[PDB]
Design a binder for these strands. Sequence first.
RNA 1: CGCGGUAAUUCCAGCUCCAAUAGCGUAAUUUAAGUUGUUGCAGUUAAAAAGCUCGUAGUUGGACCUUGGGCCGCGACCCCGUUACUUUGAAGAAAUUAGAGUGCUCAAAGCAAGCCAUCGCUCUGGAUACAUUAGCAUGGGAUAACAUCAUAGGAUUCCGGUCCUAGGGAUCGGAGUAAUGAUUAAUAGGGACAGUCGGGGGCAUUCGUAUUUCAUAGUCAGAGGUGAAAUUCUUGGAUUUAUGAAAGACGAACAACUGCGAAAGCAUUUGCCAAGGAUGUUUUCAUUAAUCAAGAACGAAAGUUGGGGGCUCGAAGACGAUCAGAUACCGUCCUAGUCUCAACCAUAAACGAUGCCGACCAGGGAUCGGCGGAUGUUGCUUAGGACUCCGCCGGCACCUUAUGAGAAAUCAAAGUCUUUGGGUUCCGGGGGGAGUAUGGUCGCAAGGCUGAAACUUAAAGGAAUUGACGGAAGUGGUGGAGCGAUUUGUCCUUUGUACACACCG
RNA 2: UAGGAUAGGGGCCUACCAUGGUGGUGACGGGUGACGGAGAAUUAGGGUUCGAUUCCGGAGAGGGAGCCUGAGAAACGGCUAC
Lengths: 140, 129, 83, 98, 141
Amino acid sequence: GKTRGMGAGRKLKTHRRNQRWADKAYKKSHLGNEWKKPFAGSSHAKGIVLEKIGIEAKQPNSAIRKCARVQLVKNGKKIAAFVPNDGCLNFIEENDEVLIAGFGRKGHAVGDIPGVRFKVVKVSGVSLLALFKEKKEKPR
Amino acid sequence: VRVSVLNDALKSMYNAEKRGKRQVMIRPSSKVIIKFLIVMQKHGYIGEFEYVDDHRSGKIVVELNGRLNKCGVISPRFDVGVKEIEGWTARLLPSRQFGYIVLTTSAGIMDHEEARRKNVGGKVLGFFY
Amino acid sequence: VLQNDIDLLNPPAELEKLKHKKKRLVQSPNSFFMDVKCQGCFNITTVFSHSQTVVVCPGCQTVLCQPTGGKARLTEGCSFRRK
Amino acid sequence: TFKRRNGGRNKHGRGHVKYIRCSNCAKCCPKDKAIKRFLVRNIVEQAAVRDVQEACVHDGYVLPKLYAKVHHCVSCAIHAHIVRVRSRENRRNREPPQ
Amino acid sequence: GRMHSRGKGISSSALPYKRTPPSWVKTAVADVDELITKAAKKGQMPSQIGVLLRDQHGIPLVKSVTGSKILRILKAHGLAPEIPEDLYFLIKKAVAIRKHLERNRKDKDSKFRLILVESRIHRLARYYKRTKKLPPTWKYE
RNA sequence: CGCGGUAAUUCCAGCUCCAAUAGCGUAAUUUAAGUUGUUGCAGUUAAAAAGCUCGUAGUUGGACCUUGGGCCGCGACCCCGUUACUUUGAAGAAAUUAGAGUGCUCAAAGCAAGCCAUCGCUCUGGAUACAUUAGCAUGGGAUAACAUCAUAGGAUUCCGGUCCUAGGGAUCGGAGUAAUGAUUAAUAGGGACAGUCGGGGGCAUUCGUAUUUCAUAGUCAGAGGUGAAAUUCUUGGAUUUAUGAAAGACGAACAACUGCGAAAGCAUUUGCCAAGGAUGUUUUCAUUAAUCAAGAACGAAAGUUGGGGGCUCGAAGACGAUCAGAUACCGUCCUAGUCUCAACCAUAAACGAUGCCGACCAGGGAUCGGCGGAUGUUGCUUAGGACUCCGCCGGCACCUUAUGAGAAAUCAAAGUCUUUGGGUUCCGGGGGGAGUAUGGUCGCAAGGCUGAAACUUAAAGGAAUUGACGGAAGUGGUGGAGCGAUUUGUCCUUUGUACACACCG
RNA sequence: UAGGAUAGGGGCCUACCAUGGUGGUGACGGGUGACGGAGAAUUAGGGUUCGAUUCCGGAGAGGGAGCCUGAGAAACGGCUAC
Ligand SMILES: [K+]
Ligand SMILES: [K+]
Ligand SMILES: [K+]
Ligand SMILES: [K+]
Ligand SMILES: [K+]
Ligand SMILES: [K+]
Ligand SMILES: [K+]
Ligand SMILES: [Mg+2]
Ligand SMILES: [Mg+2]
Ligand SMILES: [Mg+2]
Ligand SMILES: [Mg+2]
Ligand SMILES: [Mg+2]
Ligand SMILES: [Mg+2]
Ligand SMILES: [Mg+2]
Ligand SMILES: [Mg+2]
Ligand SMILES: [Mg+2]
Ligand SMILES: [Mg+2]
Ligand SMILES: [Mg+2]
Ligand SMILES: [Mg+2]
Ligand SMILES: [Mg+2]
Ligand SMILES: [Mg+2]
Ligand SMILES: [Mg+2]
Ligand SMILES: [Mg+2]
Ligand SMILES: [Mg+2]
Ligand SMILES: [Mg+2]
Ligand SMILES: [Mg+2]
Ligand SMILES: [Mg+2]
Ligand SMILES: [Mg+2]
Ligand SMILES: [Mg+2]
Ligand SMILES: [Mg+2]
Ligand SMILES: [Mg+2]
Ligand SMILES: [Zn+2]
């Protein structure tokens, strides 16, 4: 059983403190390892397109996901960022500013794309959605 | 060891009532158990009970009338002010219409409604309904 | 039997004798003291039924009782009466 | 899933039980778990009985028997058909052969 | 439950409800008291004194007749033991086991039982020091 | 989760429809999460009870002491120990929050305002509640904690002594007084005693056949081993037979749904030594107790260091087979080891995969230990033993049953749980990485204890059902059972399964 | 203990003396992407997380240090030095 005594407040508090480290979410929050991530705790980061690459999907699916290799500016960390919206790889060029965001699963890989948790959202200051919908044009 | 004689008394009574027994023997006896039993009898949840003197910790033989759904103790005996009686009754009682929380107060051992009537707080012994 | 068929306050006295000494309504010992009458000499010399000591007649005669696991064994050729 | 309440042996209120050696394969099996049979046979096959009872100098001579308590591991007892796999309900029956 | 074993025995004596002497008891109170004093004078402990008064005399229970307990009576007349009797017996058991182990080194079972006996000695000595029936600096070695 | 391989409800578009709407989409934290659990989770098999016991701190601790009664009248009446807790009061800034009033046109707000119109008035309003803990004060004393708790050596009158001071005060004694002052003995615990019981332990001692070796004697061509062989031994007598001796292990049968032990474990005799449970008790103490961080004791087997021993068996090794291969399974010879002493090691599926203490709640028949009662027969020496029967306590267990619980298997505890709280220790939080790295500590070493992260992944896992497979054995209805898939009916079946594309797995 | 110093208590400092003081009720150390609080978000209840920012308190004026004036500053929209 568990301790129930009126004078056992310290026992209960210390036990809860020690057991909270078993929870994955608690330990992810309070370990400090999220500051060693490429984004270092920020929702978005900017980076330089180093080279356009195509990485194969998982086993059941057969596709080339056509991501981008991005070197961040805040820390110089190289990441792979997915480019959604069919045809948007042609808006991506080497040595071009891009705003990266998370792939929506908090550093966990998403879908059939292995090892990618980052998507390109903005290129050269123009959103990829605007370029897909032809609402704006990429500056020369 | 026997830590709470009240818990053994109430749990034996609960088991006997569930079993359909019309008499339950309580050992040991104590003033708190006789005081809890008097509250129970006053609200009509038990019948006659008899203290048997054996020149030791006594015995109580209680008549059961089938009106008990559950009786139990709260351990620890948490401090309950008059204002926290509402929260305790919501936690432990089936409805705001029936059921009783038994408190030990400096004014005596009493049900929560009687504790409200004299505005006296204390510690929770248990409950029955 | 079924306890609904009995009264826990007035148990049948026949079945109370067979209960363990501590499991009765009011616990009582099943031992007793006895006026042991020897063969010829008076020497009443009350003995505990469950005596753990070898009781000897006052005139340093033969032993009168023998300790056992339970009730003491009176020596051969001795009577007794409960007290 | 626990197949048997006794765990395939006979061990209550004790720790270690000395093992025996299987009569067939010399396997180490606990004495309480091994299948044990007391075989009381005759030194003379039912057939040779008459021929032997005939070639006897002493007219009154009961033919001596053989008494042997045979120990078997589970694998050899099943292979030799000393015990056979039983249905779930019938396993709880410990009665000797009817 | 046994303090140092899993045994759950309930064998014990059951004092009668009647706390007054039976009518067949006729020994005067001073008589039983001076009998207790002689008994302690040879060296008997209160348990043995009670046993002898029970099986060799017409005294079922001392408390019923006199109104006091044997140890209290002995303390009144200044014959109570220095070390309390239960602690005395536990220390006797401990020294017996220690002698046996001084002869028998391989007896690991007896070593385990000695550890248990000394644990009982420390418990009872702590209680007696708290109740001031032992010297405040009384020590067992 | 999935979609896309030519008929795409899922991509690119058009049309149409849907949600929200001047907004809506996308990329830490709360909720969801009873997936951190105090309320309120788990730990037999899903993750999880330390191998076992002792033990300090901590946590938790049996019952008992002023009650009744009536009267007046819900108060009252009558017959110089603390603390927690509770009650009331004072405080606890404002803003924020809750909330009274008030038609900023509403509202979010604001703290304004309103009045037939007024040289003014409504003293206009600008409330109130909340505010842990700690502090201060008031009443209460049930519950509980701590401190005491038979030199009470209690106190009170009279008679004294000494000192100080306008008779009084302080101090030390004698003599008088009172119900002289101690709860009971827990189906709590410790201790004592008694007759027992046990394969509990240590030491010494005895015995037993087998096996190996040796000695003697007989005999002569095989023996050994396997599915079959071969390695191997053998006319210098193998194997076999008889006798005798020595050595080292091993304690069959009896032997159990039996016993003892904290666990590990413990089975030849006798003797000694200390220890232990249960039972019995009108013996004793009187709460001395439960569980436990720290700290200890023991702890199978293997393993390590050294001595002895070294029968048998036997890792490694060698060889012989089998084999497609065979570093294995099978066979032969064997090293370390297996045995013992001293010192280490501290790990097991160390399992009941179920920590310990306590209470309650079904029935039944066996069995072991003790005790009580009743028996009528003993190759018996009146008791007593041996049987028989009836009880009580304690123990290992077993059978049936659900009124219970459970995911079920199943469990009489794994029950008395959303009607959730007896006490306490350890311990789990999807699957891997991982009991890995590193640090520390212990160990001669082997290793033990403590013990991550990065990263990766959508399951892994449990129980049960149907089918299929096995180099395993020999179709509705209605009703009933099951939470259910299902099943019964239908009497290939049973069984195992990690397969279900179903073993061509 | 005695001084000195300060607006004043105080090992605040000095001289002498003693050996103390804290700690599993966690001292000491380390981390904090830590100023504290009033409060904020979410909340059946219990709770979880946040609290740089307008109110209160504290601290700093590139980093240290030292001062003058003044009732009040170790001031920085004052001075002196590194
Ligand atoms: K078996
Ligand atoms: K006893
Ligand atoms: K029994
Ligand atoms: K049907
Ligand atoms: K000063
Ligand atoms: K000083
Ligand atoms: K000035
Ligand atoms: Mg074992
Ligand atoms: Mg479309
Ligand atoms: Mg869970
Ligand atoms: Mg498993
Ligand atoms: Mg498991
Ligand atoms: Mg109590
Ligand atoms: Mg282990
Ligand atoms: Mg385990
Ligand atoms: Mg265990
Ligand atoms: Mg619960
Ligand atoms: Mg996990
Ligand atoms: Mg049906
Ligand atoms: Mg299986
Ligand atoms: Mg000074
Ligand atoms: Mg900071
Ligand atoms: Mg702030
Ligand atoms: Mg900052
Ligand atoms: Mg600002
Ligand atoms: Mg400020
Ligand atoms: Mg400043
Ligand atoms: Mg700056
Ligand atoms: Mg400055
Ligand atoms: Mg400036
Ligand atoms: Mg300024
Ligand atoms: Zn076999």
